[PDB]
């Protein structure tokens, strides 16, 4: 179900003017939707167009509980980590200039508000606030819930890019570890998601029961990222944003070795990535879906 709101326009203050509009675009099969807040900026003061374009949405983890009968051997998919990217294309005069998240954050949540001030300035606070109707500045937030995974802005990042990584990270099981994708002990294997080292039950019931996962390893990653890219005034043509939701899928499997349980954890051994690609209208303040891209690297 795809939908673009209609483009409603606020003035802010003597200076600057708000013209937003949210595209949606999902794919239901892979259980990922994107919501996209454009909010375009026009200051009188300045001479660029600004965009801060809020993605949010959901990304399922692809987690489905292992069957309990599973004897001696057993293995279910997770979600060890989520990827979300924003590039621009097709027009020069478009660049990324500043983004949030900005740094490595592992807080358990997330929560920041992001505001422009007359020139171009952005500004960021810690926590949730402004968005009012009564708000003299423009602001967006962000607020995402991580809990045992890592927040990181990718390599790649430049003038025409951001992308965030959200890794599984520190994982607690039944009160040991933290764990991770790739802990190892030399007798019992990862045991980040294993239940007992000596467990007489079956190996689909010798897990860390799904409630006890973390959300984002078993439920969904609701993401909030915020781009904010430049457009020079003396540009009239359009230009592309391709926005990318991915999930890395891990396999965990445990086995019974005859003397004791052995677990291990498969790092993305089935990646899902599906991109939208807008036509923006600088000028307009409208945005086109061009098209979208679906892909399951390994699907079973």
């Known amino acids: 179900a795809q939908h673009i709101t209609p483009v409603s326009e606020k ?7 708000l013209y937003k509009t949210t595209a949606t675009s999902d794919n239901d099969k892979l259980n990922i939707s994107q919501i996209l807040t454009f909010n375009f900026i026009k200051d009188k003061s300045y001479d660029k167009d600004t965009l801060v374009l809020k993605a949010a949405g959901n990304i399922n983890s692809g987690y489905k509980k292992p069957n309990p009968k599973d004897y001696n051997y057993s293995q279910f998919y997770w979600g060890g980590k989520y990827n979300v990217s924003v590039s621009s294309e097709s027009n020069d005069a478009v660049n990324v200039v500043d983004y949030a998240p900005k740094n490595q954050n592992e807080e358990f949540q997330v929560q920041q508000t992001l505001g422009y001030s007359y020139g171009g300035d952005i500004n960021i606070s810690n926590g949730l606030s402004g968005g009012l109707n009564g708000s003299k500045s423009f602001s967006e937030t962000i607020n995402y819930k991580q809990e045992s995974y890592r927040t990181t802005i990718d390599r790649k990042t430049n003038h025409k890019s951001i992308g965030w990584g959200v890794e599984a990270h520190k994982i607690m099981n039944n009160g040991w570890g933290p764990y991770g994708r790739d802990s190892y002990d030399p007798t019992y294997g990862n045991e980040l998601f294993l239940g007992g080292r000596q467990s007489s039950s079956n190996a689909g019931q010798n897990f860390l029961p799904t409630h006890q996962m973390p959300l984002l390893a078993r439920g969904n ?19 592309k944003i391709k926005v990318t939701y991915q999930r890395e899928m891990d396999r965990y499997t445990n086995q019974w070795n005859r003397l004791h349980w052995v677990g291990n954890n498969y790092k993305n051994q089935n990646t899902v990535t599906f991109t939208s690609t807008y036509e923006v209208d600088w000028q307009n303040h409208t945005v086109k879906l061009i098209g979208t891209d679906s892909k399951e690297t390994n699907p079973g």
Do not use: Y
């Open 11 to 17: 003035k802010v203050d003597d200076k600057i003017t």
């Open 221 to 239: 990653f609701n993401p909030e990222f915020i781009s904010v890219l430049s457009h020079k005034q003396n540009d009239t043509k359009k230009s």
